[model samples]
Target chain A: MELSNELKVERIRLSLTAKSVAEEMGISRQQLCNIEQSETAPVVVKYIAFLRSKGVDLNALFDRIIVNKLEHHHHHH
Target chain B: MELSNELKVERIRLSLTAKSVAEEMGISRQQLCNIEQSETAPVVVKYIAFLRSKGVDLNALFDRIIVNKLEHHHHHH
Candidate 1:
């Protein structure tokens, strides 16, 4: 959930429209778009690095979102 | 895994067939299909808004699907 949030925020911050990001990522815009929207899973490592190269805060994003989610679940039940 | 499940269910509930969602989101149906089936990661932001605007429950979807997988990785060991 946190990862999903960060992915959303980072993409918005980058000002890389879905179409542009898709173009740069070598995938179709719709595919990229679907990926952005679906809470299905984290983006692959390859895609994460790609976003990082564009100045996205991979650590903050992951820490704030993905790691937090993991931690919350770790201690909750 | 929960996130993936919600994505699949929401997609089904919306009656937005994979092809239709793929078309609306500007991604390929095949990629969307993969996303629907794979536990890869969460989708990015811009796309999230797109889905949300279409009346999807982002939180419930996230909580319901993405929450339970981190604790169950015993198979890896």
Candidate 2:
């Protein structure tokens, strides 16, 4: 899984609309859309802080996006 | 210094309101305020891109936010 992949998955899991997330994060809908579509990139510091506030697990979140091939082997079993 | 600590300092130094930062980053004011208040988490890649676009130094920026106990010793000295 890549960053974009994780974002899409997490967003779906959270059942959050882009607009709602944007409103919650103090960002514009357009920006959120851009982030989803990869037209723009992430702002690391602010993003980490936002996730921290949301009680998200930073390491787990990042791992979800790291694309570990070894993990696929474990899943196969 | 944590990510949140650095953000507050930078925001004040830039004389930017949450609304202003949001507009500049193409996000919403509400989200920006949430970020400032630690009500939400940061979105990494997008944020890094934003800061890079503004010609900011990533390492220096992170350093400023990182709680460097040694560096503070110099300031106090």
Candidate 3:
């Protein structure tokens, strides 16, 4: 699953608003929007943990993308 | 270990230079340098996937810091 989608899904599942989560995570709602819409990495561990606590599986979500990209890189090379 | 420290460790393990990895990952070495030095979030997933292909334990590394930060956040607030 896309990280942004995962974030959205978990947030919805937990019945939290974007503003609510973003504020608690120390970032703005716009920042949170961008994160969900963009493919970002090096995300602070704090935010990831917060999301995980909200029930998002960072590993499962990230691993899928990583494995896909690695295969793509290898195939291209 | 810190994310930057983890990057350094993995880079050393792969016997690759910073410049080498930077180019392969399509990011400037300077950008890589800054990322290692700063508390950044929303990194490009491509580079992250590239790094993991080189043996980075993103989840393990991230979890440690996340857990710490969450504790700190909770303690502070």
Candidate 4:
């Protein structure tokens, strides 16, 4: 399960529309929208670089995703 | 530029042979060895999950990889 809460947060923080982010990433708007909705995952490294260029701390954001997974792992025990 | 330092560290930490890791991940031993040498990137989420199962702090290790990218970004400016 690919998480996308950070994508939503940072995309909104920058006031960018889904179309804008999609175009920048060379992806369709639907794809970007899907990512924000957690229906899909970004598969391109360019998207990561684009987010980085927009001042997104990807490592920090990824840590949050990892934390979520860690929580799920903990719950089973 | 998919970073594999953490893969190397944790793999060595567990004293696993390349063949063992490859068999577990269902990848070729050459692929696992290539990742350790920074010659290739892991493309499967299963591999990520496998590493996580091995008590690898993927986010922390990923942060180290991101730092390397950040440094390269700095040098160009």
Candidate 5:
């Protein structure tokens, strides 16, 4: 799935609002907001890593993200 | 394994020099070199994403680079 929606679904599964999730992760809500709006942010990958460690069922979430095909643009290159 | 060592192994598996892999990835050799020297880089996550698309055996690689424990620092937060 698009990384944007995958984040939304995972948060719902986690039963937390976006603000709370960001707070728990020690990042800004805008950080989460940015990736939720789209998938360019690599921080989402880090966030997802944190989520997994917290017992978040990220495999279920990652099942939606097309990992291999997530090509980079200017920001990455 | 360390993200640094993981890149070295992957480059070896691809049978390509560091410069060739960096060129193909559309980034600077410095960029690849930086990640090869450290694990905290989220770009390495992107690198791994691209490598998987090329059928690189990243499960063998990711199995070593402890994904969950990769916490953030000033650059991330």
Candidate 6:
């Protein structure tokens, strides 16, 4: 799935407002806003922004995101 | 510059061991390990991984990274 779409779906799944989601992640609402509004940001920002929103531990988030990708691949079957 | 080369240059600029670099970033050495190894990982991982290695505050880091890209672009002229 596209990174933007994944972020949208996940944000909804998390059931938080954009403001709150950005608050949770400790990033600017602008970063989240950029992702929601368009795809112009570098691809890296897309992942890092979403990854930050998901958790604090970068290492653990890295592992989780990697696993989530595997699960995403599996679910496609 | 390519993300990988920028990372190598910055890491050398920092003059820290890979072990210490990852420690500073609070990520596993393996994430750093992957970037040094090859370009097979997703592009997003490369940026996020390098960004993490740079600092703690994600928001400030986000701003710095965006600016760094701008500076890099300016320097190319």
Candidate number with greatest DockQ: 1
Residue A58 displacement in candidate 2 (angstroms): 9.2
Identify the CAPRI category of the predicted complex in candidate 5.
incorrect
Q: Candidate 1 or 5, higher TM-score? A: 5
Q: Give each model's whole-structure lDDT.
A: 0.50, 0.51, 0.51, 0.45, 0.47, 0.49
lDDT at A14, model 3: 53
Q: Which regions of candidate 4 are displaced past 4 Å?
A: A1-77, B37-77
Off by over 4 Å in 3: A1-20, A37-77, B40-77
- How big is the positional error of residue B5 in model 4, measured in Å on the Cα after superposition? 2.4
Task: Compute the DockQ of candidate 6.
Answer: 0.04
DockQ of each: 0.10, 0.05, 0.08, 0.04, 0.05, 0.04
Residue ranges of candidate 1 with Cα displaced over 4 Å: A1-77, B40-77
Model 5 preserves the real interface contacts to a fraction of 0.06
lDDT of 6 by residue, B37-74 (tens): 65644433433343343343445434554433333454
Question: In DockQ, how does model 4 score against the reference complex?
Answer: 0.04
Model 1 lDDT tens row, B6-26 = 444444544456565456556
**Angstrom error at residue B58, model 5:** 14
Residue B37's lDDT within candidate 4 is 59
Best by TM-score: 3
Greater-DockQ candidate between 2 and 6:
2
The estimated TM-scores of all candidates read 0.29, 0.30, 0.37, 0.29, 0.35, 0.30
Writing each residue's lDDT as its tens digit, candidate 4 over B1-77 gives: 12454434434555667565456556667654444454333233322333344455555443554444343454543
lDDT of 6 by residue, A1-77 (tens): 34456445544554557565556455676765654556544433433443354443446545543434324545643
Q: Candidate 5: which stretches are off by over 4 Å?
A: A38-77, B1-16, B23-26, B34-77
Residue B17 alpha-carbon offset, candidate 2, angstroms: 34
Question: The CA-based lDDT of model 6 is what?
Answer: 0.49
